[PDB]
Amino acid sequence: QALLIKVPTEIVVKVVDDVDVAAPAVGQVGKFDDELYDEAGAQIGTSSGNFRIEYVRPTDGGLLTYYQEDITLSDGVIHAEGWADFNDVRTSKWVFYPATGVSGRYLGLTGFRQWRMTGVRKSAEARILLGE
Amino acid sequence: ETRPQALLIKVPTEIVVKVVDDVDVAAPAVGQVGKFDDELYDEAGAQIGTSSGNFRIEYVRPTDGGLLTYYQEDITLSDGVIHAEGWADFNDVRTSKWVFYPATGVSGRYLGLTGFRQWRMTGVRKSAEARILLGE
Numbered sequence: 001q002a003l004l005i006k007v008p009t010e011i012v013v014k015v016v017d018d019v020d021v022a023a024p025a026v027g028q029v030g031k032f033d034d035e036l037y038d039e040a041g042a043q044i045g046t047s048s049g050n051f052r053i054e055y056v057r058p059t060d061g062g063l064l065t066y067y068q069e070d071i072t073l074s075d076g077v078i079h080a081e082g083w084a085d086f087n088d089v090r091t092s093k094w095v096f097y098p099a100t101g102v103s104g105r106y107l108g109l110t111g112f113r114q115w116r117m118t119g120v121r122k123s124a125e126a127r128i129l130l131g132e
Numbered sequence: 133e134t135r136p137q138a139l140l141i142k143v144p145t146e147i148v149v150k151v152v153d154d155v156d157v158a159a160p161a162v163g164q165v166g167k168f169d170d171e172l173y174d175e176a177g178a179q180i181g182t183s184s185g186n187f188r189i190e191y192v193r194p195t196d197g198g199l200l201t202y203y204q205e206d207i208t209l210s211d212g213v214i215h216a217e218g219w220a221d222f223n224d225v226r227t228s229k230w231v232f233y234p235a236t237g238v239s240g241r242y243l244g245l246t247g248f249r250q251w252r253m254t255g256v257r258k259s260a261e262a263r264i265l266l267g268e
């Protein structure tokens with residue numbers, strides 16, 4: 001009924017970007033490819049995605065970025081896309097956005113992709129929380 | 133099950149029992165607000181809780197003209213309280229699409245759980261469908 005996939009290690013195996021991490025700006029973009037590891041560190045899949053910093057939120061100066069990604073797990077695909085504050089990304093805080101099970105065991109399931117950067121341009125901790 | 137890792141609460145009928153608002157649903161604008169009181173029902177038509185909440189339309193997103201709206205509510209289920217708050221696009225609210233924002237268990241069964249509150253309007257100023265999805 002409800003499923004939690006905890007991913008303590010997510011590795012960024014390639015990223016192409018013109019993001020200035022110390023000073024991000026609207027218009028900056030990234031395309032990335034990740035590998036995902038379970039709680040005892042075997043491979044559970046890959047993600048491929050991109051993002052774009054889109055606007056400055058006037059309430060807090062947030063640098064609102066749109067992410068879109070396909071997470072190919074070993075027992076089904078999951079699509080995730082939505083908004084994140086890049087000021088949270090770069091200060092190692094958690095972000096999240098909707099995820100939709102696209103096939104396999106994940107057919108029918110919807111919920112949320114969560115992650116926090118543990119290593120600039122290199123690693124993240126992630127969760128995938130799903131229900132039916 | 134003891135100490136589930138993940139937990140889904142399905143709310144197929146959420147009735148808005150009381151709403152006070154100055155929102156023009158046909159042409160919404162920044163500064164408009166509502167306060168709402170809801171009753172939550174399971175698949176069997178039993179009442180599982182209530183919600184007390186408010187919202188404010190805060191800003192216009194330059195991307196798409198989205199009307200970004202900040203929600204906040206206290207959801208009292210019969211077995212504990214969940215707080216939830218965050219951003220939703222009022223264009224989605226009014227065209228009956230799903231919206232969501234973070235949720236945090238505050239007491240009872242939900243203490244120490246976090247996840248998301250999600251809902252879709254099924255009738256403006258009348259009713260919605262909803263899900264609370266939590267993890268530990």
Ligand SMILES: C=C1OC(=O)C(C(=O)[C@H](C)C[C@H](C)C(=O)/C=C\CCCCC)=C1OC
Nearest residue numbers: 012015019030032117119120121122123124
């Ligand atoms: C899922 C990721 O969301 C990210 O933002 C990110 C990145 O690494 C960017 C592609 C590079 C950019 C310069 C950056 O933000 C760097 C640090 C974040 C590290 C990982 C965060 C998940 C992602 O993975 C590639």
Ligand SMILES: C=C1OC(=O)C(C(=O)[C@H](C)C[C@H](C)C(=O)/C=C\CCCCC)=C1OC
Nearest residue numbers: 148151153155166168253255256257259260
């Ligand atoms: C879960 C709800 O979150 C809402 O925003 C809402 C409402 O009904 C508003 C309080 C009134 C506003 C004028 C409106 O848009 C009315 C309907 C929205 C969708 C229908 C119910 C979700 C909620 O329930 C009270």
